[model samples]
Each structure stands twice: as C-alpha cells, then as structure tokens.
Target: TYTTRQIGAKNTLEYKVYIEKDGKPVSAFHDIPLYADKENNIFNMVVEIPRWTNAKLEITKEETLNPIIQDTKKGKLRFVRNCFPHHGYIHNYGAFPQTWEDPNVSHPETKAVGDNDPIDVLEIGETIAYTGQVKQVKALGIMALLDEGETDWKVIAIDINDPLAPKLNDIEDVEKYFPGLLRATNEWFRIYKIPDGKPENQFAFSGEAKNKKYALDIIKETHDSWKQLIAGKSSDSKGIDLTNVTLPDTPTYSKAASDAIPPASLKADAPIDKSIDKWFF
Candidate 1:
C-alpha cells in the first residue's frame, strides 16, 4: 500500500511518495530497485527511447515519468531536452541506477561539472529495449558533452546479456562494428540545442569518445557523489539543515559563481544552475 503527499504549494507543488509494495515502503529515488549488480557499477538502466529518430519528447521531473529523477531543488530534472532531427536515436537511451552528478561538483580532468541528476546512458545492441525495462549493461565508453557550460557525460554501454555484447569491448569496437554510429551520436548532441535558437558555440563535445575504463571511473565518481549527497541522512529524512552545509568556494571567473559572491549580490539571488534547466533527455 502507498499514498502521496504534496510537498509544496500551488506552482511549487510536488507529490512525494516511494516505491511501495505489500505495504512496505522503499524510500529514496536512488534506492528504487535497480534489479542489477551495484558492486561493479553495472546496474539496471531504464530505456526511454524516442518515438522517432529525429525527434524527442522532453520528460519533466515534476511527474513520475522518470522514477529515478527526484524532485530536488525547486522540483526539476537535470535535462531540458536529445534526439536527432531526421533520424531517431541510434541506440537505446536511458540512465543508470543510484548514480547522480552533483552540479556543484566538478570533474578533475575535464574540469566539467555535474548536472545534478542520474548520468545518461546509450546502450547499443541488436534488440530494442522497451520503456521501463531494466537491462544489465557494462560501460564501454563516454561522450563528454558540455550542455550550456555544464558537464553532461553520456555513458556508452552494451547490454551484457545481448548476443552481440561480446563483440563490443570499447568505443573502438563500436566504431568497428557500427561505423558512423558514434559520429552520428556526437552530431545529435551538437545540434539539438539549435531548435531553441542556441548558437553553435554555446555547447560542444569536450573530446573524442573515451574508453570503457574512463567511463567506469566517471560512473564510480558520480556514484560517490550520490553517496555524499545522501550522507548523514536516510531517504525518510526531511528538511535538510544548512547550518553545517558548507558550499564550495566561489569561482573567480564563472558567471554563475560570480553572481553568488556577496556584497553586490542582489536580493533576487540567482538560482543554482545545476544543468537541470539545461540540455535534453
């Protein structure tokens, strides 16, 4: 048995509930059953395939559209909109369980930051995975995407159970088996922002596709971020205390960070741009 309660009022309203079955409640969006192994960073990923190759339907965080997306910070998911214009996604699109990118945190190497949501994933194989279907996958590579200046990593993976999984061991394998697929995937991210009149320079790929080992390191990093996010509290805990919550030091040149620097900072404080309002599904 389960029920929902509104967390806020009017335009700020958010329904709160948990994964419940047989009268037992499983708290926390991150704790929702992944149905896969967590030790190896191999967890169940839910596919949200686009209806068409060239188009995409954005899923907001306000609803139960994505069970893994929690209504954190003003109630929004990390992505604002990804899909090809004339071609659908080349692979199944989804996200890993129990992983989150802390928008406030930055990756050491790329210096790119988190988007405050589960890391996005694209699994390539012969069989098409359905919506709500969970698949055990192994990371093969990553697309280091910069969405509106935020680090948005798309983990490229292959379903281990798939018959064709053995053939692809890395991004190089993907290029060898499915030539041009990676190029098209990169192009999709490059142009998806144009629909909103965004200039080409606003967003771009950070680097070439990285190998599986690099992708796993990223996955582990995000998972650790998630753990830190939930530290000192359980899923049922309410009303975080900010007294001891120390924010990171303000950056010298970041426009977003500059606005947060005191003194001249206005009453209408700029909201934290956690990439929630940036990029696509």
Candidate 2:
C-alpha cells in the first residue's frame, strides 16, 4: 500500500489525493512502476473508487503529477447512480498506471478507439480499497465496454492478498468459484450509464469476458502506448501531463517544480455529498 494524503477541501474542485513518501511528492502516473511481478502476471493498480462508493474518483491524467481526484461536471461533484441491486460500483474500480489507451489506435478486437485514459481495472477482492491505494492484482479476465463508442476495456482482477486469490487463476476459475459475479459485473457496466441518460453500452465477444492471456495482451499494448506518451513520441498526448519529480533532467521531469505539489498540510475532508445515498429509477 502507498501513503497518500488529500489536498484541498473535499467535495470541491480543489480536492485531490497526492503521493507523499519519504517527504517527496511523486506522481501516481509516472512515479509508480506498472508491474509488481511481471513474471507472475501481477500488476500495480491505483485504486480510484472503492467498492460501494458513489463518487467517480479518478487520476487526473491532464494534470501534472497526476493526482487522484473526484470527477466533477457542471461545477458539481459527480457520483455514479445506484443502478439498483447494486448500491455502488460492484468492485474496487481503478486503473493501471503507466498504461494509456491511446485514442489514435483502435482495439484489436473491438475496433473502437481507446478511451485515451489509463486502462481501467475491476478488483474483485473482498477488501475495500482507499483512494490512491496502490494494490497488486492478478488479471483473471477482460471485458470490452464500448462506452458510447470508445473502447474502455475493463480488466477483471483480484488483489493478490485476497484469500480467494489462490483459487482464481483465470476467467474460467472465476466462474467455478464465484458463480454470478461475472454476470453481475457485466450487467452493472451495461446499465451503469443508462440512469445518466446515456444509451446502453455495447460490448465485444457478444459481451463475453475474454481470458487472462487476452487481457494481458491488451495491457501490454496500452503500456507501449504509455511509453510513447512519456517519451514525447505519441502522435497525440491527449492533454495528459507526463510530469514527474523523478529526474532524467528531461522535459516533464522537474524536481523543483513537483516539490511544491502536495499541500503543506492537509485539511479536514468536507462531508460527502448527500445525494449519493438516493437511488435512481
């Protein structure tokens, strides 16, 4: 787990979580290594939204130092609808750092362009992850969420520390052990946007979840795209700031610039929005 602290007032536009370790302000995107154990297929995931939480928290890719922040729209904090039978996100939803779904490229199977954000992950473990928590997860399967028309791939994973982690080696094992979760997850993603007045999302493989090997291939693809992004070679950087305190003494790397990032002192978090509790029809 990584040490994180909130900067700015909660429930406000200023609120964001930063990585502060050894008194250095590093980036959640550039500073963190992507793989925890590449040989064993474990990955470093940045927890953006905990299970049962409504706030649509995510790492702000366009911002320098890439802090985790609650998403907002029209000057108000954004929260996901309950889409009932599900109170909030069915899993600990997050993203894989050092990976970018380049909008310029199309997915291998879906053929839709990438969402141009970090590749999203769905941690199926039992524990509730905190915002900015860096957790190691093993990929079990992948789902193609055709968000509007963008390919927002959702990789299903399990925290390495979870008790059931040992039994789940692939998507098939997930079916054997925790029977209906895959369906529930698929259903949740399908209807999650409906309450927002968005059209029903589409999926590839006829909505079937692909195996781990397929998922890993997608991760590798996005990771290569990320390499180009930070190297200033990506055809389109898509407004993501590759800034980091780590120095190559290169562009986007400045020790002095990021040194002043984290708040001098964190403030008490403002109360969560009251509307988060209401169920949507």
Candidate 3:
C-alpha cells in the first residue's frame, strides 16, 4: 500500500529503501497499523527479505523514517550464509510495525530482554512476498529465540490472503496441515548462522512453538512497549529517532522535521556485487 524509493548509491552505506505513501515519506515502523483485523488477531507484517534471498535487509530503527537498509558488518554488506540443506531464508522474513520488543524489559518465559528491534515474523505462504510489501498476516504461533543472548521472539504467521490460511489457525494446526514445516523452521534457525562462524541459535520451551493465543499476547505486549517508546518512556531508547509522519504531537520527535526529511532522487538499482555469488554449503 506504499511506494518505495531507492536512495543513495546501491550496495553502499548511502543506499536504503525509503517508504512513501501518497508522495510523502512514512516511517515503516511507526506509520503502519499493527493489526489488519484485531478482532481476528490478524496483523501487518512488513516483509524485509523475500524467501530464498540472502541479503540481510532490515528496518533501520535509529534512522529517521526507518528505511529498509542492507545490514553491514566489518565494513562490508552482510549476506546470510546458506547452511547446507537450506538454500536461504526459507520464508518471507520480516517484522511487524508499531511493535517493539523493549530491550530494557525482559520476557517472562525466556527472562531475556528484547533484541532492540521490531519483533520478527516468518510468513509461510504459497507465493513469495516482495521486499517492503506490507502483508496482512495471521499469527499462528510464537517462538522465543535467544539471539546473542537477547529474547528475539519470532512469530510464525501466514498471509491471510493465502489459500492455506483458512486451514491453519493455531500452532498445532501448523503441523497437522503442513507437516514438517515447523520442524524445518526450527532447524533452519538453529543452524542458519553456523556457516558464518557464529554458534547455533537457541530457543525457549525446548524449541516448541507457542499457541496462537500466546502469540497475540506477545504482540499486544510489544505494541504497548512501542507506545511507551514513542512517548520517550523506554528505559533505553537506543538513540532511535522517533520522528514519524503520523503522531504529530508525539513528544519524542517532531512531525514537521520528519516531513522535512529530504526527498530522495530515484536511481537505478545497484548491481549485485561479485562476492554475493559464492554460497556456503
């Protein structure tokens, strides 16, 4: 429902995918509504990386307008290493807007605080979602992944518009309808980073995915944390610019200043670098 502008030189620090709606820039994290159908527990998911893609793109929490940017590490752009038996990100990986896992507040179950970003989502659907596509999804379950010692909750959701969406309503239904997908997802997380020299990822509940009801509770709590964040009440704001197109009276950042963010001059897509061609087994 929004237009995207590619700003700066591609594959460089200046490159970013800034979002626009009706000719004005919008904060992907703050402008988008969290729930597509709150009564049905459906939510909005901003797809950051399409299935099978490897570039590590994420919503920039500290930048104004929070453009989707390619993550960098050690002076180079980061691409996920394919840990054999898996090609790339197995699902449409993204995050929810208007939801923040408060880094200062610890999750009760994992006792680990937030990862300082929007909660992650895994969209299981028949079709591939484009990067930055605002997808309407129904959260089927949630998993507490301890990433680098932070409570990174990954919500397993399905596109509400998908045909299979009607059949899977809960975590149990995930296995009943699409057997082996859940187990595959867990295994994917557990080893996807091993190829990069990082240790295997860990999860809570013995690696079990929690139910739909439990997932909603997590979303609601995260949304509440976001509200507190925008109000400057978060114990550690993490230096994120709270400026947004919506919320004119928010005390954290000025709306007019956010609107004044320079318009990007559209450019051609950046050529994929040669190094990205090599894939790890």
lDDT of 2: 0.85
Measured with C-alpha atoms, the lDDT of residue 122 in candidate 1 is: 87
Q: What residue runs in model 1 are displaced by over 4 Å at the alpha carbon? A: 1-28, 32-35, 38-41, 50-85, 201-206, 232-281
Per-residue lDDT tens digits for candidate 2, residues 231-255, read 8888888778888776474478877
Instruction: After superposing candidate 3 on the true structure, give the runs of residues whose Cα lies further than 4 Å from its correct spot.
Output: 8-12, 262-268, 274-281
TM-scores of all candidate predictions against the true structure:
0.62, 0.94, 0.92
Q: Evaluate residue 262 in candidate 2 and report its C-alpha lDDT on the 0 to 100 scale.
A: 54
Using lDDT as the measure, the top candidate is 2
- Report the lDDT tens digits of candidate 3 across residue range 23-91: 667888888889878887778899998898788989999888898988989978888877667767999
Highest TM-score against the true fold, candidate: 2
Q: Give one clash count per candidate, in the order shown.
A: 11, 0, 0
Error of 2 at 98 (Å): 0.4
